[PDB]
Structure formats: C-alpha cells, structure tokens
C-alpha cells in the first residue's frame, strides 16, 4: 500500500533548483549525509544514556558506504536513531521549510550550493548525483519505512517488507547516468578524506564484487 504525497511548494522549488542548476561541486552531497548519519547516531547514542534499552535494537553506531555498479547505487548506512512516519511526511518538512526560504536567500545574496548544510536541508543535495532516492528507516517507536522520491513535485511512502534494519537509516542513491564516479573506490575514498575525515563514527567503504 503506497502513499503518495505532495512536497511543499517551497521544498519542491528548491529540488528543482538542485537539479537544474549549473554547479560542478557536486561531491559535496556525499559530506552532507555522512554528516547527517553522524547526526542521527549523535541523537541515539545521547538517547541511550538515560535509557539503555534504545540500544537494544542494535548496539554499533556505524557508518557503510556500499556503491553497487550493477544497480548503480550508492547507499549510505547508518545505524542512528532512524525516522518515524510522521518525520517522514510531516515534521522534516515542516523544518525544512524555514531551511529553504533563508538558503534561497543567502543564495541570492551571494552564498553557493555547498553552503545548503548550514540551513538543514543538506539531504535535498543528493538530487546533485540522483535521479531517485530511495530511503529506509526505522525508528525504535514506529515501523520500517521506505520513503522515495524522482523529485517532481512528489514522493512516496510505503511500509517496508524488505530485509529488517534493526534502527536506523539507508539513503540509496539511484545515480544520474553520468555521476557514476561516485561509484569508484579511489573516488569516494578522496571525498571521504577530504569532507569527512574527522567523523566520530566508523566509516566502512564497502568494496564491489
Ligand atoms: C526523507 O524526507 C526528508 C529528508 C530530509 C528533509 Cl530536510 C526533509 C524530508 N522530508 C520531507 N517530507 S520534505
């Protein structure tokens, strides 16, 4: 059973302007969801400290990055506090709203693309390198989700009956027919070192069969 969903007008311009946009920088969306996941695992890990029991849906606090060339996907994993629904539908838009008006702004005045993490809506880069993002997630309150959006106007939500995760989030990357670098070991390596390299959660670069 899928849902399909309008974004806001605002969020909808906004991926339209990722996507359309001139802008050759776009190794920057691999910096903004590793920092996103860092995020997610930050919440968990201070949640656990008054309650130990939120680990028991899993104890690593981790990072994989697995590329896949046969699907040409890239997929970011992480074990953080994941979503629930109404995050999905509801409350990240309704953050990302505010987000989307002062980055347009500073945009207009001057700022560029990479800045887009500073106003909360750094996940929207991956329509940089993706025609389509898919995302799993489990939160400990609520139900395994798949939320995915080709931008257009509209996403979907569906619950997932797919492998159980446990907790946490995977953001898989359907990639543009000409971004498939990022599939590359030595390329994701360089951006990795470059953006990321003082993560406080383990980084695994998953390599391919
Ligand atoms: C997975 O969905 C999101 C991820 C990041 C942000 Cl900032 C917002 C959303 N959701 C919306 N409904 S706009």
Known sequence: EVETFA??????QLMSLIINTFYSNKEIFLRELISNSSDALDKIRYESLTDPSKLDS?????????????????????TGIGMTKADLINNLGT?????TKAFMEALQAGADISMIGQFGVGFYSAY???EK?????????DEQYAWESSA??????????????????KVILHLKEDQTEYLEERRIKEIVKKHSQFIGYPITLFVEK
């Not at 974004?7 to 909808?12: G, M, T, V, Y």
């Not at 697995?66 to 992480?78: G, S």
């Not at 993002?133 to 309150?141: A, G």
């Open 7 to 12: 974004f806001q007008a605002e969020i909808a």
């Open 58 to 78: 899993g104890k690593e606090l981790h990072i994989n990055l697995i590329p896949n060339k046969q699907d040409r996907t890239l997929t970011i994993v992480d």
């Open 95 to 99: 953050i990302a709203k505010s987000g």
């Open 128 to 130: 940089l390198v993706a």
């Open 133 to 141: 993002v898919t995302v799993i997630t489990k939160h400990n309150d």
């Open 152 to 169: 257009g106007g509209s996403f979907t939500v569906r619950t997932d009956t797919g492998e159980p995760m446990g907790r946490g989030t």
